[PDB]
Design a protein around this ligand. Sequence first.
Ligand SMILES: [Ca+2]
Ligand SMILES: [Ca+2]
Ligand SMILES: [Ca+2]
Ligand SMILES: [Mg+2]
Length: 280
Amino acid sequence: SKISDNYSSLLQVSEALGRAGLESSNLIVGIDFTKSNEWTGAKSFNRKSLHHLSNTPNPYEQAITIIGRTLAAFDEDNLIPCYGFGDASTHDQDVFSFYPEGRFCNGFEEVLARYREIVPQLKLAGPTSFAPIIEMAMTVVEQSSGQYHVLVIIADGQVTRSVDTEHGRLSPQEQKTVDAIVKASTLPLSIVLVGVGDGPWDMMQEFDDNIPARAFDNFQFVNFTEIMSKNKDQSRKETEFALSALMEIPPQYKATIELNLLGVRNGNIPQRIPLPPPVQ
Ligand SMILES: [Ca+2]
Ligand SMILES: [Ca+2]
Ligand SMILES: [Ca+2]
Ligand SMILES: [Mg+2]
């Protein structure tokens, strides 16, 4: 069933996790390197590309940074597998690992550094689909034998569609993304979409709230731009981010126990191989 916003403060989330008795969790990060990032910073990033490097941190650097300051404790060994998708080497079919032999980033400081080192070497492309990043996460979970994971996807939310959809019919990219979300729910995996840039966010909100075929609500949408836009203190910004990102985690974690997913091998999860980073 659909999971609502049941907590009005970070403290309530923490207590809910306390009651549920969470003992162990790990993070997975996926980063959208599709071409739409060049134009979804029109209003929110002064007509620059969301991936543009300079003296000001771009929204991806900001999200990675805030994620590291607020969610780091939810990765138990501070080793974070990072993947990119949607550049010219992966299109809508594959992901690549941040490092050549699948070596994990040691801390989000290194996630941020490696991001900076990689992104100007990429050809931003497409089409845009979340199926490969989610399928990657599924393989990480299956290979750990059903250890609980949270996949954090940082993206601009522009999954490929036709503007004159006729009407409510999904693109292949949307349909494959939905199928991946539905299949993911046979595994102990939480997904958090951190939306950067201008939106629009209709489809992310649909992933969040309305996929009847899945076994539990396994997908939360965080509007990162709207949180950072609020004329409000920086510590209150990060607290509001943490709250939004963790909002569904206590019920999702509980669902993995009640649906007998936690610690169990599914047996029907194809092994996705990440491509090497297309870099020097
Ligand atoms: Ca880890
Ligand atoms: Ca949801
Ligand atoms: Ca939600
Ligand atoms: Mg795109």
